[PDB]
Amino acid sequence: MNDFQKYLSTAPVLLTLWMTFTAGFIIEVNRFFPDMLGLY
Amino acid sequence: MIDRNSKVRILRKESYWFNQIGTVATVDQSGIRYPAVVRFESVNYAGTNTNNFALDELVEVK
Amino acid sequence: AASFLPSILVPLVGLIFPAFSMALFFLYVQTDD
Amino acid sequence: EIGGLTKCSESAAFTKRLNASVKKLEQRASQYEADSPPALALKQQVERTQARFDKYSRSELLCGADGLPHLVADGRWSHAAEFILPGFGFIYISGWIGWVGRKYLRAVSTSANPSESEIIINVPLALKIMTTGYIWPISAWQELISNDLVAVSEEITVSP
Amino acid sequence: SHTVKIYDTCIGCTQCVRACPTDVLEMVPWDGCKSGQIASSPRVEDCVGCKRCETACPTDFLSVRVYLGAETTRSLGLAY
Amino acid sequence: ATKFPKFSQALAQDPATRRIWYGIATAHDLEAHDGMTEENLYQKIFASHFGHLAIIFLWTSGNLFHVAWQGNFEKWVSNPLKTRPIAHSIWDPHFGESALKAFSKGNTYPVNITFSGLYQWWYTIGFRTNQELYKGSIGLLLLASVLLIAGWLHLQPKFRPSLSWFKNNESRLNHHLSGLLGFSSLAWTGHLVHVAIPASRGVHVGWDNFLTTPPHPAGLTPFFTGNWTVYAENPDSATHVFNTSEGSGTAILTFLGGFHPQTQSLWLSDMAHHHLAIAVVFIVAGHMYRTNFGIGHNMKEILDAHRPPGGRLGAGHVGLFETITNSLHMQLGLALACLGVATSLTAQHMYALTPYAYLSKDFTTEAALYTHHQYIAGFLMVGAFAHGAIFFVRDYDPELNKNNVLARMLEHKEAIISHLSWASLFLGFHTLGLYIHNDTVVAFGQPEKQILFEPLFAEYIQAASGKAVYQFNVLLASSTSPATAAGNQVWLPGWLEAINNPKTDLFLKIGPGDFLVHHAIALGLHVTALILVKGALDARGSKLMPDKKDFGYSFPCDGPGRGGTCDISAWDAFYLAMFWMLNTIGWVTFYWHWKHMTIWGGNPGQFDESSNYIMGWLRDYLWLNSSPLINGYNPFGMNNLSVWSWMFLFGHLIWATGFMFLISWRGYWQELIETLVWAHERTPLANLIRWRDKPVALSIVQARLVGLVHFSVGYILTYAAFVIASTSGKFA
Amino acid sequence: DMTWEGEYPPSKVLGPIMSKMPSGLLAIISMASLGVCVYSCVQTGFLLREPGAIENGSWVRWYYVVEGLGGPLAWGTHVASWIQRKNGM
Amino acid sequence: FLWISGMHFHGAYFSNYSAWLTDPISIKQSSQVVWPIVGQEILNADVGGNFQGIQTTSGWFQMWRAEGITSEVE
Amino acid sequence: MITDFQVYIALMAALLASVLAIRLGATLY
Amino acid sequence: VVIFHFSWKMQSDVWGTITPDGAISHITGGNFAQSSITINGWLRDFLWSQASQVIQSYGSASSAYGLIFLGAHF
Numbered sequence A: 001m002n003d004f005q006k007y008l009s010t011a012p013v014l015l016t017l018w019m020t021f022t023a024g025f026i027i028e029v030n031r032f033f034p035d036m037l038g039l040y
Numbered sequence B: 001m002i003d004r005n006s007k008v009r010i011l012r013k014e015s016y017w018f019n020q021i022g023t024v025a026t027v028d029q030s031g032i033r034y035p036a037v038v039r040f041e042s043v044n045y046a047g048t049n050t051n052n053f054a055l056d057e058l059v060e061v062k
Numbered sequence C: 001a002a003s004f005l006p007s008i009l010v011p012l013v014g015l016i017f018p019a020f021s022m023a024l025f026f027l028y029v030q031t032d033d
Numbered sequence D: 001e002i003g004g005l006t007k008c009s010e011s012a013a014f015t016k017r018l019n020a021s022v023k024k025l026e027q028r029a030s031q032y033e034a035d036s037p038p039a040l041a042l043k044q045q046v047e048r049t050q051a052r053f054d055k056y057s058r059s060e061l062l063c064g065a066d067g068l069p070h071l072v073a074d075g076r077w078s079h080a081a082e083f084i085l086p087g088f089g090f091i092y093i094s095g096w097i098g099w100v101g102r103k104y105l106r107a108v109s110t111s112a113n114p115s116e117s118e119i120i121i122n123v124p125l126a127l128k129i130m131t132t133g134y135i136w137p138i139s140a141w142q143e144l145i146s147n148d149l150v151a152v153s154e155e156i157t158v159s160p
Numbered sequence E: 001s002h003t004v005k006i007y008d009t010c011i012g013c014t015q016c017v018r019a020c021p022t023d024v025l026e027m028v029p030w031d032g033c034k035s036g037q038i039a040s041s042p043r044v045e046d047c048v049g050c051k052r053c054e055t056a057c058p059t060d061f062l063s064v065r066v067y068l069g070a071e072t073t074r075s076l077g078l079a080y
Numbered sequence F: 001a002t003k004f005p006k007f008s009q010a011l012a013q014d015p016a017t018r019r020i021w022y023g024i025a026t027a028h029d030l031e032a033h034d035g036m037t038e039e040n041l042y043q044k045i046f047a048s049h050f051g052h053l054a055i056i057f058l059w060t061s062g063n064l065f066h067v068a069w070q071g072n073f074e075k076w077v078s079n080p081l082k083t084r085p086i087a088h089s090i091w092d093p094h095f096g097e098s099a100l101k102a103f104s105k106g107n108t109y110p111v112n113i114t115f116s117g118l119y120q121w122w123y124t125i126g127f128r129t130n131q132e133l134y135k136g137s138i139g140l141l142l143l144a145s146v147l148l149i150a151g152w153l154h155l156q157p158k159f160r161p162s163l164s165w166f167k168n169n170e171s172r173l174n175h176h177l178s179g180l181l182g183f184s185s186l187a188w189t190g191h192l193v194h195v196a197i198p199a200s201r202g203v204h205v206g207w208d209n210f211l212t213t214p215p216h217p218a219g220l221t222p223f224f225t226g227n228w229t230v231y232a233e234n235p236d237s238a239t240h241v242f243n244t245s246e247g248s249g250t251a252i253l254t255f256l257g258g259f260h261p262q263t264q265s266l267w268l269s270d271m272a273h274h275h276l277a278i279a280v281v282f283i284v285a286g287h288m289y290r291t292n293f294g295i296g297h298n299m300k301e302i303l304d305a306h307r308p309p310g311g312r313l314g315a316g317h318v319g320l321f322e323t324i325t326n327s328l329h330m331q332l333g334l335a336l337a338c339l340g341v342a343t344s345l346t347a348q349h350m351y352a353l354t355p356y357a358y359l360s361k362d363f364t365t366e367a368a369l370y371t372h373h374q375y376i377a378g379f380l381m382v383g384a385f386a387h388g389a390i391f392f393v394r395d396y397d398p399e400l401n402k403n404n405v406l407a408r409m410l411e412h413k414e415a416i417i418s419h420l421s422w423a424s425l426f427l428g429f430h431t432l433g434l435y436i437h438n439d440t441v442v443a444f445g446q447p448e449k450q451i452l453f454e455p456l457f458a459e460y461i462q463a464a465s466g467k468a469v470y471q472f473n474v475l476l477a478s479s480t481s482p483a484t485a486a487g488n489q490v491w492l493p494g495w496l497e498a499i500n501n502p503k504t505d506l507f508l509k510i511g512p513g514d515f516l517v518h519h520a521i522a523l524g525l526h527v528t529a530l531i532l533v534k535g536a537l538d539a540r541g542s543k544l545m546p547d548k549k550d551f552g553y554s555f556p557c558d559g560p561g562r563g564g565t566c567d568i569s570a571w572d573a574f575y576l577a578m579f580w581m582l583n584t585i586g587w588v589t590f591y592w593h594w595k596h597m598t599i600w601g602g603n604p605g606q607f608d609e610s611s612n613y614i615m616g617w618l619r620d621y622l623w624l625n626s627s628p629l630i631n632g633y634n635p636f637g638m639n640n641l642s643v644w645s646w647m648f649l650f651g652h653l654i655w656a657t658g659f660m661f662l663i664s665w666r667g668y669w670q671e672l673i674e675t676l677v678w679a680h681e682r683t684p685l686a687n688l689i690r691w692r693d694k695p696v697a698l699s700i701v702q703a704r705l706v707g708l709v710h711f712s713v714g715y716i717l718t719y720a721a722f723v724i725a726s727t728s729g730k731f732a
Numbered sequence G: 001d002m003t004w005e006g007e008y009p010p011s012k013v014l015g016p017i018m019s020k021m022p023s024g025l026l027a028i029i030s031m032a033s034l035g036v037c038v039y040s041c042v043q044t045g046f047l048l049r050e051p052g053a054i055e056n057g058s059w060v061r062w063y064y065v066v067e068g069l070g071g072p073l074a075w076g077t078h079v080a081s082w083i084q085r086k087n088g089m
Numbered sequence H: 001f002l003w004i005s006g007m008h009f010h011g012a013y014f015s016n017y018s019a020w021l022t023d024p025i026s027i028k029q030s031s032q033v034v035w036p037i038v039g040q041e042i043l044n045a046d047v048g049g050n051f052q053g054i055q056t057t058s059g060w061f062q063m064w065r066a067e068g069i070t071s072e073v074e
Numbered sequence I: 001m002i003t004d005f006q007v008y009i010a011l012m013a014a015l016l017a018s019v020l021a022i023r024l025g026a027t028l029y
Numbered sequence J: 001v002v003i004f005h006f007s008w009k010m011q012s013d014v015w016g017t018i019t020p021d022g023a024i025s026h027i028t029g030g031n032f033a034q035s036s037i038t039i040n041g042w043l044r045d046f047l048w049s050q051a052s053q054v055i056q057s058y059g060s061a062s063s064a065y066g067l068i069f070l071g072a073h074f
C-alpha cells in the first residue's frame, strides 16, 4: 500500500489525474451553463 | 575565514557557481596555486559538484 | 540598325561573357603566384 | 453606438442568422421521423440554438454589420462582463496556482532529498499548501514589503 | 594548425592526454598543483579539433582550451 | 599570400576547396585582412563607396534607356488609365511561337509590363517625351564615369584622405545636414516650381526656355518684398484636368491638403511647399557644430554633460563619443536601423498619401511597391542588430564605458531578455488561442460564439484626425473642438474630405479582424527582437561559454560537451532571426494584400468576416486567388502569366532545397564524398584527370548560410509571383 | 571636462556667455520669453479663427513667428537660472 | 486483444451494422458516436438507417459480413 | 524616337564606364 | 508519392460510375494522362482541386477533417 501510494504520487500519474479532474469540471460546467461569451 | 566546513561565496566570474554559496572541504597548505576545495549542491553543465579556488576568490558567508 | 542589337548582344552577354569570366576565375584561383 | 455598432437585439442580421441556423437543423430533422432518436436529438439542438441567441439578445453585447457579437475592452464598465469581470477571475486563479507552487518548492527545498520531492510529490503537504492560496494577494504584498520576495544580487550572473 | 592552450587551473588528472585521438598532449612535471604534473601540447600539428580533451577536463572552466584555426590535411582528417 | 585568398595566409595555405569558398565570403571584411592598418581601411572603404554609387546610377540609367527605347511612355502619357506600361523587350531564343504571341499581346513585339511605378513618378515630375528620358540616361552614364574616376583618384598616393579627415564628425554632419539634405531639397522645390507644376498645367518648360519662362506671373518680386501670400493665390480649380490648362491655377506654394480630384494624388503645389519648409529646417540645423569658425557645439562635451542628477542612469553618456568614433560597426548599425524605419515609413505612407498620379488605379504596382519596401526594411533591420553584436565582440571597450549607459544595459541583460520572452509568450498564447477558438466554433457551425474584439483604440485615433464612421465625437471629428476651429480655414477642408471618402486608402476602415492580425504582427516583432537582442547581449559571453569573446562573432560550436553547444555563436542568432523576420514580414504583406484585394474587388465583407479565423485566410485568400497563377500554362495552352506561374514553382523548389542544408549536417556528407574520391582514383580513363583542390564537404557555418539563402530566395520569389499574377490576373 | 557629479552641474556647461550671467537676470529673461511666445500663440489663434480674411495664409505674421521661438528659449533660460543659482552665482 | 474487443463492442452498441446489412449499397458504415457536448454533435452525420454517427473507414462491416455475423449479439 | 545614332552614342559612353571600372577594381585590389 | 499516385490514378482511370449502357464517368475525368506529366499539373489538378473538400468542410459533419488539416500543418 505505502509503495503503491508512492507510485500514485509520482509526477506523471498526479498530472493525469489532476488534469482529468480539471477537464471534467470544465466540461461539466459547460454542460449545465452552456454558450457563454461573457458573464451574461 | 576559509577553513574546513566553512561556507563561502564564489567570486570567480567564469564559475558556474558565481555569487553562490559552497562549503570549503579542505585547504591545502603546500603553496599550490589554488588551495581551497569547495563543494556545491548543484551540478554544473558538465555534471561536477566540486572545484578548487584560491582564497581571494572566496568570501566567507555567515 | 539598332533593332538588330538584341539578337547580336544577348548571345554574347549570356553565353560568351559568362564562359570567359568563369575560365579566368578558375585560372586565377588555381595559380600559385 | 460605440464604434457605430448596433445592439444585437436590434440587429436584423443577428436575427437572420438565427432563423437560418434553425432552418438548417429542421430541414435535417424532416428526413428522420416522429420520435426517432435522431429526430429528437435535432429537435433538442434547435432549442439550445434558440436559447443562445436569446441570451445574447438580452445581453448588452453589440453586434456589427455581419450580425456577429463584437466585444468591447477599453475599460468602460458598461461592458465589464465582456473582459474586466472575467479578467479578475483569471488573475485570481492564476495567482493562486503560482503562489502555491512557489510555496511548495521553497518548502520542500530544505528537505532530506529536495529533488525526490519534485518528482514524487508529497501529496499531504501539497494539499495543505494548495488550500492556503485563497489569500495570495494579501500574502504576496506582505512578503514584498518584508523584503522576502525579491532577492538582492546574490544570484548567479553571466560572465559579462 | 589549431591552437591548444593549458591554464594554471590544471590539476594533473591526465584525463585530457588519455582522450586525445592523435597524441597531441603530454603530461609534464610541474609544482603548481598537488599532483605535481601539468599538461602540455607539444604536437598541435596533429590536432584534429575534436575537443574530446575539453570534454574530459574536470575544472570549473576548461583548463585546456582548443581554438580552431588554420586547416591542413592533418587537421581536416583527410585520408585521401 | 600566393593563392586565391591573398588577404589570408591561413585560407591560402589550405589544401581543400574551402580555400575558394571562404575567400569569396571573407572578401569584404577588410578589417580582418592580413596586414590592415586603420588608415588603409578607411581609404579603401571610401573608394568602395564611390563604386557602389556608380552602380546605382548605372542602374537608373538603364531603366530610363530601356523605357525610352523599348517602352510606351508617350502613349501612356496620352491615355494613362487605358495603357499598360512597358519595361523592356524580350528576346528569348527558347520561346515558342505561341509564347511570342502571348507576351506580345497589346503590342507588336514580346514585352514585359512594369510594376515598378516609374511611369507615374516620371509623369508627375515632368517627363513627357522619350527624348527627355534619353537625355537623362546619358547624363547618368557620364556621372557614373565621374564617380569611378573619383574612386581611383582618392586611392592615389597624394589624394588619399588622412585618418583625421575621416573622423571629423562636426564638419561632415554640418555639411551633410545643410547641404546634402537641406540644399538638395531647396533644389528640388526649384524643379517642382519651374518644371513639374508648369507641365501639370500644360506648359512646357525645359532647358530650352527655363531661363525665359517665369515660374510665376508676379515674379520674384513678392518673395523679396515679403508678400509671400501671392504665391499661394489662385490654386488649381477642382475641375482641373491634369496635363492640361483647363481649370488651371497660378499658385506655386500652397497648403491645400488632400488629393487632386482627378489624379487622386497629392497636390504638386503642396509638395513644393513641403520641400521648401524642410529645406529651411535642415539648413538651419546644419549650423550646430563647430567647424573651424569658432561658433558651434562640440559633440563630446554634449554627451559627457548629460547624466541624470538622480543617478538612475549611472554615469550617463560619458565615453560613448570615443566608442562611436572608433567603431565602424556601431555606426553602420545605427545607420541601418534608421534606414530600416524609413523604408517601412515609405511603404506605409505611400499607399495612404498617394504621391504619384494614377498610381492608386494601378493595383498591381501598388501591391509590389509595398511588399518590396517592407521586405527591404526587414533585411535592413536585422543587419542593424547583427552589426550591433559584431561591435560588442570586436570593438567594445569595457573600461572606457565604465558605468556608462551602454555598460549598464549589459548589466541587466537577463531582465531585458526575460521580459521580452514573457511578452512574446503572452502575445503568442492568446493570439493563437483566440484564432483557434474562432476556427473551432465556426467549424461546428456556431459563428455567433466567436471572440471578436473591436479595435477601439485605433478607431479613436482615426476619429481624432477626422473620421466620422466610428461616431467617436472627438477632436477633428468634433465641430466644437478647438482643434477643428484652428485648421478649419487652413488645411482641414481638404483633409476632412479625403479622410471621410470611402474610396481612398487614407485611414482605411478597421474592424475586429484587423485587431487580431495586428497582435500577430506584434508577436513577430517581439520574437524577432528577442533573438537578435539576446544574440547581441550574449555575444561576449554566457554561462555555457564564459569566454565566447575570444572565439569571435561566428564559430561552428564549442563541442559536444558541457551538454552540447550547437548554434551558440552570435552569428547563429542572425541565422535564427532571419526566419522569423521573413515570417513577420510575410504576415504583414499578406494582410495588406488581402485587405486591398477585397476592397478592389468590391467585397470588403469577405475580409471582415473570414479574417477572424485561420481557414478563411487559407481558403478565401491563398486558395481562391491562386487560380489565375496556377493556370498560366495548362494542358490547353498558355498566357502572359506563364512566366509568373513558372517562377512560383521555381521558388518552391529552392525553398525546399534549402531544407536539405538545414536539416542534414556535415558528418554524413563528408563520409559520402570520401567514397566518391575513391571511385575517381580507381576508375580507369578518368584517372588521367585529377583535382588540385582536395574535395571536401561544406563547413558547418557555410551550410547554414547556404541553406538560409536558399530558403530566403525561394520565399521571396514565390510570393513575388503570387502578388503579381493574382492581382494582375484578376484586376488587370 | 564637462563630466560632472553631484546634484547640480557646473556653470561651464551653460556655455561661454551665460556661464557668467546672474541667476536673477536669466529668470527675468525666461519669464519674458515665455510671455511673448504665449501672446503670439493667442493672437495668432484669433487670426486663424476669424471668419475668412485669412485666405492665402494671411494669418502667418513674421513677428509672431519670431516671437513663438521664445518658448524653447524660455525652457533653456529657466534651466540655466537654476544651475547658476545652485552654483552660487 | 483489448483493441479488437473494443471495436466489436462499439460495433454492437454504437453502430448501424444491422441496417447496412440489409441495404449495403445505400447505408454508410458508422461505429463511433460523439456526445452532445459543445456543438461537437455536428460531427454525428446522418449516415443512414435512422442512425447518426461518424463514418468509419476501417472496413469492419465488410469483414463481419464475410464471416457471416448477421446479428449484433454475435 | 531614339535614333540609331543615339543608341550608338550611349553604347560608347558605356564602354568608357567599363574601362574606368576595371581600373577602379584593379586599384582596390 | 506512392499514395498520391494511387489516389489520382484511381480517381481518374478506374473509380467512377457507369450507366446502364456503357458510359463510364471517372471521378476526375481522365486528367492523369496529360496533367500528371508536369509538376504544375499535380499542384493544380490534384492538390489544389482535390482539396476543395477539406477547405470547405466547415459547418458540416466533415468539419473535423478541416480542423485537423490545419492543426497538422501547424
Ligand code: CLA
Binding pocket: C010, C011, C013, C014, C015, C016, C019, C020, F093, F094
Ligand atoms: C542568353 C543565353 C542563352 C542563349 C542565347 C541560348 C540559345 C539557345 N539555346 Mg540555350 N541555354 C541557356 C542559355 C542560352 N541559350 C542556359 C543558361 C541553359 C541551361 C538551362 C540552356 C539550355 C539549353 C538546352 C538544353 C538547349 C538550348 C538550346 C538553345 C538553342 C535553341 C535555338 C535553336 O535554333 O536551336 C537549334 C540550334 C542551332 C541552330 C545551333 C546554333 C549554333 C550553336 C549555338 C553555336 C554555338 C557555338 C558557340 C560559340 C560555342 C560557345 C563557346 C564558348 C567559349 C562560350 C539556342 C541557340 C537547344 C539547342 O539546340 O542547343 C543548341 C537545347 O537543346 N539551351
Ligand code: CLA
Binding pocket: F046, F049, F050, F053, F165, F166, F168, F171, F172, F175, F176, F178, F179, F180, F181, F184, F341, F342, F345
Ligand atoms: C555639402 C557638402 C557635401 C555633400 C553634398 C556630401 C555628399 C555626400 N557625402 Mg560627404 N563629406 C563632406 C561634405 C559633403 N558630402 C565633408 C565636408 C566631409 C569631410 C568631413 C565629407 C566626408 C564624407 C565621407 C567620409 C563619406 C561621405 C559620403 C557622401 C555621400 C553619401 C552617399 C550618398 O550619395 O547618399 C546620398 C543620399 C541621399 C541624398 C538620400 C537621403 C535619404 C534620407 C533617408 C532622407 C531623410 C529625410 C528625413 C530625415 C526622413 C524623415 C522620416 C524620419 C523621421 C524617419 C554623399 C554624396 C560617403 C560616400 O559615399 O563617399 C563616396 C562617405 O563615405 N562624405
Ligand code: CLA
Binding pocket: F024, F025, F026, F027, F028, F029, F030, F332, F336, F379, F380, F382, F383, F384, F386, F390, F553, F554, F571, F574, F709, F713
Ligand atoms: C551598408 C550595408 C552593409 C555593409 C557595408 C556591410 C558590410 C559588412 N558586413 Mg553586413 N549586413 C548588412 C549590411 C551591410 N553589411 C545587412 C543588411 C545584413 C543583414 C542581412 C548584414 C549581415 C551581416 C552578417 C551576418 C555578417 C555581415 C558581415 C559584414 C562584413 C563582411 C561582409 C562579407 O564578408 O561579405 C563578403 C561577400 C559576400 C558574403 C557575398 C554575398 C553573397 C550573397 C550572400 C548571396 C547573393 C544572393 C543570391 C546569390 C542571389 C541569387 C538568386 C538568383 C538565383 C535569382 C562587412 C564589414 C560579416 C562579418 O563578419 O562582419 C564582421 C557577417 O558575418 N553582415
Ligand code: CLA
Binding pocket: F421, F422, F424, F425, F426, F427, F428, F429, F430, F432, F433, F527, F530, F531, F575, F576, F577, F579, F580, J074
Ligand atoms: C508553427 C511554427 C512555430 C511555432 C508555433 C513556434 C512557436 C514559438 N517559438 Mg519558434 N521557430 C520556428 C517555428 C515555430 N515556433 C522556426 C521554424 C524557427 C527557426 C527560425 C523558430 C525559431 C525560434 C526562436 C529562435 C525563438 C522561437 C520562440 C518561440 C516561442 C515564442 C513565444 C510564444 O509564441 O509563446 C506562445 C507559444 C505558442 C502559442 C506555441 C505553443 C502552443 C501550444 C499548443 C500551447 C497552447 C496553449 C493554449 C493557449 C491553451 C493553454 C491552456 C491549456 C493547457 C488548457 C513559441 C513557443 C522564442 C522562444 O523561445 O520563446 C520565448 C525564441 O527565442 N522560435
Ligand code: CLA
Binding pocket: A013, A016, A017, A020, H002, H003, H004, H005, H006, H007, H009, H010, H014, H032, H033, H034, H035
Ligand atoms: C481501443 C480501445 C477503445 C477505444 C479507443 C475506445 C474509445 C471510446 N469508447 Mg470504448 N470500449 C472499449 C474500447 C475502446 N473504446 C471496450 C473494450 C469496451 C468494452 C468495455 C468499451 C465500451 C464503451 C462504452 C460502454 C462506451 C465507450 C465509449 C467510448 C468513447 C468515449 C470514450 C470515453 O469514455 O471517453 C471519456 C473517458 C472516460 C470517462 C474515462 C475517464 C478518464 C480516465 C479516468 C483517465 C485514465 C486514468 C489514468 C489511466 C490513471 C492511471 C493510473 C495507473 C494505475 C495507470 C470513445 C470513442 C462511450 C461512448 O461512445 O459513448 C457514446 C461509451 O458509452 N466504450
Ligand SMILES: CC(=O)O[C@H]1CC(C)(C)C(=C=C/C(C)=C/C=C/C(C)=C/C=C/C=C(C)/C=C\C=C(/C)C(=O)C[C@@]23O[C@]2(C)C[C@@H](O)CC3(C)C)[C@](C)(O)C1
Binding pocket: G024, G025, G027, G028, G030, G031, G034, G037, G041, G068, G069, G070, G071, G072, G074, G075, G078, G081
Ligand atoms: C529672484 C528673482 O529675481 O526672480 C526669482 C523669483 C521668481 C520670479 C519667482 C523666480 C522665477 C522664475 C521662474 C519660476 C521662471 C520660469 C519657469 C519656467 C519658465 C518654466 C518652463 C518653461 C517651459 C517651456 C517654455 C516649455 C516648452 C516650450 C515649448 C514646449 C514649445 O514647444 C514652444 C513652441 O515653440 C515651439 C517649438 C513651436 C512654436 O512655434 C510654438 C510652440 C509654443 C509650440 C525665481 C526662480 O525664484 C527667481
Ligand SMILES: CC(=O)O[C@H]1CC(C)(C)C(=C=C/C(C)=C/C=C\C(C)=C/C=C\C=C(C)\C=C\C=C(/C)C(=O)C[C@@]23O[C@]2(C)C[C@@H](O)CC3(C)C)[C@](C)(O)C1
Binding pocket: F225, F226, F227, F228, F284, G062, G065, G066, G069, G072
Ligand atoms: C532650435 C531652433 O531651430 O532655433 C533656431 C530657429 C531659427 C528661426 C532657425 C533661428 C534663426 C534665425 C532667425 C534670426 C530667425 C528669426 C526670424 C526669421 C524666421 C527670420 C528673421 C528675420 C525676419 C525678418 C526680419 C522679417 C522680414 C520681413 C519683412 C521685412 C516683411 O515683413 C515684409 C512685409 O512688411 C512688408 C514690407 C509689408 C507687409 O504687408 C508684408 C510684410 C509684412 C511681409 C534661430 C533663432 O537662430 C535658431
Ligand SMILES: CC1=C(/C=C/C(C)=C/C=C/C(C)=C/C=C/C=C(C)/C=C/C=C(C)/C=C/C2=C(C)CCCC2(C)C)C(C)(C)CCC1
Binding pocket: F329, F330, F331, F332, F333, F334, F337, F341, F384, F385, F387, F388, F389, F391, F536
Ligand atoms: C544592437 C545594438 C545596436 C542597435 C540597436 C538598435 C537596432 C536599436 C533600434 C531602435 C529602434 C528601432 C527604435 C525605435 C524607436 C521609435 C520611436 C522612439 C518612436 C517614437 C514616437 C514618438 C516619439 C511619437 C511620435 C508621435 C508624434 C510625433 C506626434 C503624436 C503621434 C505620435 C505617435 C505619432 C547598436 C548598433 C546601436 C549598438 C549597440 C547594440
Ligand SMILES: CC1=C(C/C=C(\C)CCC[C@H](C)CCC[C@H](C)CCCC(C)C)C(=O)c2ccccc2C1=O
Binding pocket: C025, C026, C029, F020, F660, F661, F664, F665, F666, F667, F669, F696, F697, F698, F699, F700, F703
Ligand atoms: C549536399 C551537401 C554537401 C555537398 C555539396 C557540395 C559538395 C556542393 C558541390 C556543388 C557546388 C555547386 C560546387 C560545384 C562547383 C563546380 C565544381 C565549379 C567550381 C569552379 C570553381 C572555380 C569555383 C555538403 O558539403 C554539406 C555540408 C554540411 C551540411 C550539409 C551538406 C550538404 O547537404
Ligand code: SF4
Binding pocket: E004, E019, E020, E021, E022, E023, E024, E025, E046, E047, E048, E049, E050, E051, E052, E053, E054, E066
Ligand atoms: S582537440 Fe582532439 S586532437 Fe586536439 S588536443 Fe584535444 S583531443 Fe587531442
Ligand code: SF4
Binding pocket: F556, F557, F558, F559, F560, F561, F564, F565, F566, F567, F700
Ligand atoms: S556543432 Fe558538432 S561538436 Fe558542436 S555541439 Fe553541435 S554536434 Fe557537437
